[PDB]
Amino acid sequence: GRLYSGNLAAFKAATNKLFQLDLAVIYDDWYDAYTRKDCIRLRIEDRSGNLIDTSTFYHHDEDVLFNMCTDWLNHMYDQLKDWK
Amino acid sequence: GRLYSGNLAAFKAATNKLFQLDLAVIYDDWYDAYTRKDCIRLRIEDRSGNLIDTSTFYHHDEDVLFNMCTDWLNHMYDQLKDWK
Amino acid sequence: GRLYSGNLAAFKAATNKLFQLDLAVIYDDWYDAYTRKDCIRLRIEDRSGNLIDTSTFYHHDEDVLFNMCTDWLNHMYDQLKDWK
Amino acid sequence: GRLYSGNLAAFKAATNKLFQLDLAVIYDDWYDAYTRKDCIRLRIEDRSGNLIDTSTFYHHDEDVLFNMCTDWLNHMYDQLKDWK
Amino acid sequence: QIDFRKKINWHRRYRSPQGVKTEHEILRIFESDRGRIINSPAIRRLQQKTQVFPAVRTRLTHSMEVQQVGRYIAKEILSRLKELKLLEAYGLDELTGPFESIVEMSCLMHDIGNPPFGHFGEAAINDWFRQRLHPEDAESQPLDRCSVAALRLREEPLNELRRKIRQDLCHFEGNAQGIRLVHTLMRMNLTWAQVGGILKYTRPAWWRGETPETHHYLMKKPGYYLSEEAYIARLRKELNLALYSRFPLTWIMEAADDISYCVADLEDAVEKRIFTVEQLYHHLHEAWFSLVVENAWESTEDQFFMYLRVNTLNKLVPYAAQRFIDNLPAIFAGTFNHALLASECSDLLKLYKNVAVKHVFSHPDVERLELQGYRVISGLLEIYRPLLSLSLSDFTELVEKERVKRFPIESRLFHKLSTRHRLAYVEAVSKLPSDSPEFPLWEYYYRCRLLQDYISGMTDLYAWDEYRRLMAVE
Amino acid sequence: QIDFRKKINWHRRYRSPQGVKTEHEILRIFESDRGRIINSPAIRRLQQKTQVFPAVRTRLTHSMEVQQVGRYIAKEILSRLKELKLLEAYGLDELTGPFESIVEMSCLMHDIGNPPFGHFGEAAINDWFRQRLHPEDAESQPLDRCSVAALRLREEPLNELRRKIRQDLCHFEGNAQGIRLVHTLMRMNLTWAQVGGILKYTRPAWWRGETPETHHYLMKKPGYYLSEEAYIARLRKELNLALYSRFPLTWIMEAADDISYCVADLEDAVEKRIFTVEQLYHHLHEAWFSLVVENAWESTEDQFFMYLRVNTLNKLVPYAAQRFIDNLPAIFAGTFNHALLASECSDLLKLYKNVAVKHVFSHPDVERLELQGYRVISGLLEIYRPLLSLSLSDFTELVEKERVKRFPIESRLFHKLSTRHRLAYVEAVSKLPSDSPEFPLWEYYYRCRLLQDYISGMTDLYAWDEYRRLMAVE
Ligand SMILES: Nc1nc2c(ncn2[C@H]2C[C@H](O)[C@@H](COP(=O)(O)OP(=O)(O)OP(=O)(O)O)O2)c(=O)[nH]1
Ligand SMILES: Nc1nc2c(ncn2[C@H]2C[C@H](O)[C@@H](COP(=O)(O)OP(=O)(O)OP(=O)(O)O)O2)c(=O)[nH]1
Ligand SMILES: Nc1nc2c(ncn2[C@H]2C[C@H](O)[C@@H](COP(=O)(O)OP(=O)(O)OP(=O)(O)O)O2)c(=O)[nH]1
Ligand SMILES: Nc1nc2c(ncn2[C@H]2C[C@H](O)[C@@H](COP(=O)(O)OP(=O)(O)OP(=O)(O)O)O2)c(=O)[nH]1
Ligand SMILES: [Mg+2]
Ligand SMILES: [Mg+2]
Q: Catalytic site residue E111?
């Protein structure tokens, strides 16, 4: 019922990989009212404090939720390395 | 605030001394309603179950109460060895 | 598969009971050749070394064997207290 | 009767010294049939797998045997640094 | 006429289900019994009790193997009756399911009453009491070394109860303690058929004299205590048993225990650096032998026993099934006077038993732990001696008020007894007539039982630690 | 068309039985599997592993409760199909017996691969390796922080194997280790159907990237290692499974584990002087609730959980059976993407989980033993570091001669590894082509696996003692 270590390692690796390109990621988590699922909001910003993108993910299983967070972070990373 | 060992030893010695003369002693203790003091009732009976005497003592200090019980037991013992 | 303590206690009690009447009991045990059962021989003698009686019991279970030994010893005891 | 640590250290140092010049050393040890002495064979080869030299040493004492191995390795090293 | 519907009783003692049921409801009733037994503290406690050596087997793992052997035997017996079309004449047509469950659960809880340290813990309880009551002096006309004034012989009607109480307290047995544990203390409220499967012997613990010749095997050890003379009468009335008779399925649980007796010990020794397989091979060969043990030789230790067990099972289980089927009327009547296992199959077991006795049960480490346990139990029985010297009024006041200024030491010893034991004592005492001359005798008997239950309800480690702590050593 | 005869396979891998069999022979085949599993050292070792608290439950007793829950669920499902006359169309007419046995044995050995200290022992193995190989640097074109010369990226065909080996070694999982334990090391030689019931997840441990949207639940954790890519293909061929699919019966074992998750912990806490029933009553009430928990209130601790468990079972098991029956085609295809347990029955479990998280899993004693185990495993992984720094020729000479005068320290570290692990390594290496450029890579992979197997095959106490002994403290 807990979160497997590999998923957490992948999440941290993605955050470091896209932070070493002069970006920043802010994280928040909470519990939904009636949807009965955990909620994670991520925001990717720059050094100057400007907000570049936001996303929100809903799921009642920790592993699936963190996998979605990691692959979304990877998609943002490679679409910001497509240009600039 | 507790009861000193010597008083308890004297009580037990008196009970054994007057029990070795073919008697028996029954004991009961309780707390008073509004007099704010502990209550001890003693009854001296014979082997045949006949009740010979009763007494009741009231006091809010354990040592004084047990001293009164012991000296009453000694008085009963020597007044039953005055005759019979 | 072992021998219960109560049976051993009964055996020892019987031996002491009938030894305190100026008798003696000698014991020997072995294993049978083909009958596949343990063998116990008891001999009851007197102080003067004269042999009074002998008996032999065969069984493959320890508890039953010791019960037979004990009840035989009791029978000998009370038939020697029938007279003399 | 054992092998002293200094001789082993010298052997390892010689192997590393002549391996850091793009060479390689292969080792094998056994016991002789009737000569009653230990046997050590060394082969010095290159990176490309070509065999450059071989040698074999016989002795019944470990320390002398390893000293001979070490000084032979040093001779090969400095005669391969004489040219090329 | 054999009919198993009159033996498999699914009623209970409290809040018993009544009416007419179907197969599904009976199966549901019998599954709840498994649910209760498996999640009980008594079964959990078995993982801290030593079998032989203090990846070695505890009492829980050994019971988990006896359970498998018994289940396999039961299934073989049931299969052999379908090939003869006798499952409809014998009434087992709609009761096959509970047949295995009763046997399996009886196999599991066949060792819940044994005291700490085993056989040497049972003697210590017996010896210590024999010097307090001296039953041997109550077998004839009144003479006396009894240390209790209310039990010395002086009044025949009271004399009979005196001698019964004096004899019963010196016969402690694990099998007799299991019934008390499952009925009075734990209060599991199991079905009659499940309780009947853990009653192995039928001799009352107060019995004095010679046993009848027709039951000299079923009477070799005590079966139940004097506090259950009313509970066993109802059990015999429910399960249709005569006096001094045994339940049928109990014969299977007895056989499964005998097969798994000395095969695991050898594996424990071989993995405790004692001897090697080669040595073991040599010991067995020089022991006698068929084609049961040779074929298992050809890692190595992990796959030698792993085939020797299968070889011995495939040749021993069918013999047990055949013996059960052949002697069916006598077993069903409950008067069969033998065990299922004078044949070649009985020699192979004696082989293992002899090897284990000669080379395993004589190691110095096993024998020392048998002298230490004797000492520990004897010492623990002597610390609580003050509780057995009080008077009836004093003990009553102590159990009622629970804060006594006259007994500073005894009031603290009494508070270390477990709660359930004290409730058992209170409930047992509250059912006796106060205006009766036999009240002190029963009160003393129940006090001694309470002490015995507390001593025997421990583990080998907790008792050892308490013994060191109460003697101001640790 | 659903047909369970094509799923219940009774063949083996070595010396498999061939031909046509009957019901009795199939039952005999499946009983031997139980006999092998129950008398195995891996199951025995479970009685020295801590569940939560170091009469508290070990891993063996918790598995013995999961087994009962799974058996009850299986019997309920089988009963519900007879009331609809579907046991002949679905092929389960003559296979009811093995249906329960497979589920029960899968429930028993669902925790044999977990390392010592649990979840905090699994991270320590993963972190220590991540600093040695750095898989994150092998996800793109060759750049490198790898500490092994034979695994750094430089040659695409070798690069793919390099990145696969580097990714696999940093994903250690207990479920993936169970298959390796039952197949390669222990060599139990079980039937295909029994092995298929312990394969819970289907993600290869070398998988990099994003999972398909149709399997995002069955891919959430690694399922098997790279050393079993040949054994799982044959398993899928025997049991008729597509790529990335699950065995049907595995859904039941997963549900039984979820029901028995946080009910036992609460009882352990209540018997470890943490809180009282009254407090527990209050915590639960303020938690939310039906008529499941209230009715159990009316000793006391021994008979509150004893009815709360029954209440929760009688309302949760039928829901699981109905969910299994309703979604039968998708489960049989192996592509169902949910678990059997958004309903009112799922809230009651979350209640217990929240209470346990808030009041039990935060006690100071539980958290310290999680910091100590991390330290111990990390320390033990560093003592055996010298074995991972040798060359291929040096390690080959060491494993062959077993008495080397050039490596006095490493030759003594190698002799402490268990024998079966060394035979596993020798057998794995002896099947590779020596004249191939990929030999060193596979040799290093198998050496790392050997070290991981040795570390994860211990108990919490043996590892702790060895850690203190090898550091010259004790
Ligand atoms: N010490 C501790 N134990 C926990 C915690 N959360 C859960 N547990 C316990 C309760 C469970 O019975 C036990 C095993 O469950 P886990 O959450 O570790 O996962 P499990 O192996 O059941 O999941 P799986 O199917 O393998 O993904 O761990 C926690 O935060 N701390
Ligand atoms: N362990 C324990 N300590 C107690 C108990 N009752 C009282 N105390 C503690 C509280 C007091 O601070 C401390 C000393 O008081 P005592 O009642 O022993 O008598 P104290 O010496 O004050 O009386 P004194 O003026 O000498 O007659 O004993 C008890 O039952 N057990
Ligand atoms: N330490 C030790 N253990 C023994 C000895 N003889 C047998 N055992 C072990 C092997 C058995 O698995 C275990 C229990 O068997 P017992 O002979 O104590 O009797 P058991 O309770 O099975 O018999 P029962 O049906 O109750 O009369 O004791 C011995 O001399 N010493
Ligand atoms: N623990 C251990 N002791 C060994 C070993 N080989 C020999 N010994 C013991 C047996 C000898 O009585 C003792 C001392 O002999 P050594 O081989 O250490 O050399 P020793 O000092 O006699 O030689 P030396 O004349 O000084 O070169 O060491 C070994 O491999 N391990
Ligand atoms: Mg047994
Ligand atoms: Mg589990």
A: yes
Read off the amino acid at residue F106: S
How distant, in Å, are the alpha carbons of F282, F291, F292, F308 from that of F297?
A: 12, 11, 10, 8
DSSP string, A33-57: SSS-SEEEEEEEEETTS-EEEEEEE
E345 & E368 share domain: no
Inter-chain contact E216–C4, Cβ cutoff 8 Å?
no
Does E257 share its domain with E296?
Answer: yes
Two structure tokens written together for E345: 């199959």
Instruction: Using the atom order of ligand 3, give the atom closest to the CA of residue E119.
Output: 18
Kindly give, in sequence order, each residue whose CB lies less than 8 Å from that of residue B18, ignoring residues fewer than 6 positions away. Answer: B25, B44, B73, B76, B77, B80
Given CB atoms, is B39 within the 8 Å cutoff of chain E?
Answer: no
Q: Measured from the CA of D2, which atom of ligand 4 is nearest? A: 17
Total number of domains constituting chain E:
3
Contacts of E386 (CB under 8 A, 6+ apart): E409, E410, E413
Single-letter amino acid code for the residue at E461: L
- Nearest-atom number in ligand 2 for the CA of B1 is 17
CA distances E134 to C3, E158, E159, E221, E411, Å, are: 21, 17, 15, 20, 29
Domain residue limits, chain C: 1-84
Q: Which tokens belong to F111?
A: 């925790």
B78 token code pair:
């020597």
Distance, CA of F300 to chain centre: 36
CA-based nearest residue to E330, from E235, E246, E256, E253: E246
Q: Is E406 on the interface with B (CB under 8 A)?
A: yes
Say whether C67 and E222 touch across the interface (CB within 8 A): no
Nearest ligand to the C-alpha atom of residue F114: 1
Nearest to C13 by CA among E174, C5, E120: C5
Does residue E456 contact residue E177 with C-beta atoms inside 8 Å? Answer: yes
Closest residue to B8, CB basis, from E393, E397, E406: E406
Indicate yes or no: CB of F36 within 8 angstroms of CB of E303. Answer: no
Nearest CA owner, ligand 1 atom 11:
F261
Give dist(CA E118, CA E129) in Å, integer: 18
D3 close to F (CB below 8 A): yes
Cα dihedral angle (E245, E249, E250, E256), rounded to 10 degrees?
A: 150
Q: What is the resolution of this structure in A?
A: 3.1
Do residue E234 and residue E256 come from a single domain? no
The strand order across the sheet containing A38-46 reads A23-31, A38-46, A51-59
Domain limits for position F17: 1-114+171-246
Q: Which of E193, E221, E246 is the last residue in one of the domains?
A: E246
Residues on chain F touching E65 (C-beta within 8 angstroms): 38-39
